[PDB]
Amino acid sequence: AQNPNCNIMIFHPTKEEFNDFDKYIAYMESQGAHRAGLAKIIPPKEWKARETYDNISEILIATPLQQVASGRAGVFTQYHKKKKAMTVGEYRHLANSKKYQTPPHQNFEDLERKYWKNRIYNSPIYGADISGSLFDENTKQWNLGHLGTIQDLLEKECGVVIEGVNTPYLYFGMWKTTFAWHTEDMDLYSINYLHLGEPKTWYVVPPEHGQRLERLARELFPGSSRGCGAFLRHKVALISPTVLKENGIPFNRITQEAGEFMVTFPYGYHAGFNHGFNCAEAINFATPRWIDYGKMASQCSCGEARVTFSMDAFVRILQPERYDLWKRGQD
Ligand SMILES: O=C(O)CNC(=O)C(=O)O
Ligand SMILES: [Mg+2]
Ligand code: NI
Ligand SMILES: [Zn+2]
Numbered sequence: 267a268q269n270p271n272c273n274i275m276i277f278h279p280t281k282e283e284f285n286d287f288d289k290y291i292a293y294m295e296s297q298g299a300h301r302a303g304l305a306k307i308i309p310p311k312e313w314k315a316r317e318t319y320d321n322i323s324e325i326l327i328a329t330p331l332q333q334v335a336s337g338r339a340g341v342f343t344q345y346h347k348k349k350k351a352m353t354v355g356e357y358r359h360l361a362n363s364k365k366y367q368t369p370p371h372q373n374f375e376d377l378e379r380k381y382w383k384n385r386i387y388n389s390p391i392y393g394a395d396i397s398g399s400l401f402d403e404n405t406k407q408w409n410l411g412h413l414g415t416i417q418d419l420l421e422k423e424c425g426v427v428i429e430g431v432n433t434p435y436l437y438f439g440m441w442k443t444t445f446a447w448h449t450e451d452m453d454l455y456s457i458n459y460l461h462l463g464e465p466k467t468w469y470v471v472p473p474e475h476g477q478r479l480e481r482l483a484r485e486l487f488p489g490s491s492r493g494c495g496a497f498l499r500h501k502v503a504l505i506s507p508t509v510l511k512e513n514g515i516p517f518n519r520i521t522q523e524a525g526e527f528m529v530t531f532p533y534g535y536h537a538g539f540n541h542g543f544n545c546a547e548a549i550n551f552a553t554p555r556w557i558d559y560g561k562m563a564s565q566c567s568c569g570e571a572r573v574t575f576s577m578d579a580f581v582r583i584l585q586p587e588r589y590d591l592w593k594r595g596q597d
Contacts, residue, residue: 269298272472274305274518281310284407288414291455291529291553302518303534304470307527309408315525316402319462322545323355325436327393330357333444335386340506341486342386344444349391354438354545357393361440361543366390368441368464368542374521378467381539382506385442393438400436400461400547408527410434410459410549417576419552426583430576434549439466439540446501447479447537451573452580453559454550456530458522464542466522469507473533475516479505482513499566504537532559560584567595 269275275297279290290307299305331346352360360366371377399411406412415432441464450456460466471479480498484491487503494500510517522528524544530536532555552560561584565571578596582589 267298268296269301272301272303272474272516272518274302274470274520275299276306276308278308279310281312281407284310284313287408288553294529295555299529300531300534301472301474302470303472303531304468304518304520304536305529305531306520306522307408307529309525309527313405313407315405315459315461316400319400319545322400323353323358325354325396325398327352327354327357327396327438330391330393332389332391334389335504337386339383339386340509342504343487343490343502344446344504345502346392347389354393357391357438357440358543360391366440374465374467374541377541381442381467382508385444385504385539388442390440390442390444392440392443393436396436396438397433398436399434400545408459410457410547413549413551416454416550416552417579419554419556420580420583423554423557424583428579428583430579432550432576434547437546437548439463439542439544439546441540441542443540444504445536445538446503447483447505447535448498448501449476449533449535449563450530450550451577452584453533453563454552454556455532456548456550458528458530458546458548460522460524460526461545461547462524463544464540465524466538466540466544466546467519468522468528468536468538469510469517469519470530471515471517471535473531476533476535478515479535482510482515494566494568494570496564496566497568497570498535499564499571501571532556533563557584565592567591569595572596
């Protein structure tokens with residue numbers, strides 16, 4: 267069995283190997299990369315996402331989200347307060363202001379310590395989930411707006427033809443902006459490219475151990491657990507590495523830098539934070555190996571999770587017994 271300790275693997279494809287996306291995902295899996303829940307892919311030196319970022323300040327962040335925490339430093343939830351629209355140029359200036367800028371620090375480890383000590387005492391503003399792409403149309407390799415669609419994968423594997431679309435999303439971050447513990451919708455894969463700026467630190471639980479994290483989360487957030495049998499789908503709960511280690515939960519960590527891809531694998535729980543002003547692009551995707559995870563994915567039906575249009579078909583075809591309850595939570 268490859269990668270039996272479920273370590274995060276780092277890949278350096280050559281320019282030839284970078285041509286065929288599906289083939290390279292299958293290669294990484296042949297080496298056991300999925301067992302970690304997360305892999306890093308460093309593009310070949312000949313590749314570029316686009317020519318320059320000199321022209322991005324005019325993008326609009328229609329609904330910036332202020333991430334307000336409640337709890338203790340290692341076990342907290344966050345809620346998103348909507349703020350007035352601002353441009354990327356306005357948001358970058360805000361990120362760099364004295365109130366929001368990254369503090370002086372020695373190295374990534376010192377910064378990580380400061381994040382977990384102090385996160386709860388601040389409310390950073392995140393420009394998340396903005397439909398769009400920063401890949402040049404002429405970039406043919408690993409262009410996240412030119413991937414094979416999840417609908418097409420389901421049609422090819424299962425023969426059924428469904429509505430829905432699959433497009434990328436932009437994320438503008440600042441110091442302390444936070445992504446809560448989650449798996450993807452329908453336990454899909456994700457791929458994330460850090461276009462520019464400061465790093466992103468990730469934490470991940472191996473898919474084979476995801477239910478250990480779920481059981482800890484039910485203990486740590488007991489009112490939330492009574493509210494919903496899949497409350498991690500709400501994407502609001504944080505648990506620190508120190509608390510994970512105290513409770514024996516297997517996990518790994520890695521820091522992504524600008525120019526690097528990360529892939530999350532089906533049912534790989536992940537969480538993390540941004541080091542300073544940055545911009546990432548991410549999208550969900552499927553492979554044949556995903557289908558069994560899609561069939562078994564948990565679902566929130568309490569109303570909180572609310573998701574895209576395109577998840578309807580996935581539930582309807584893969585989980586017909588659950589469909590009626592889940593759709594009530596959508597409506
Ligand atoms: O970058 C972020 O804030 C969150 N991204 C992801 O959870 C992902 O790419 O799957
Ligand atoms: Mg612009
Ligand atoms: Ni994710
Ligand atoms: Zn719920």
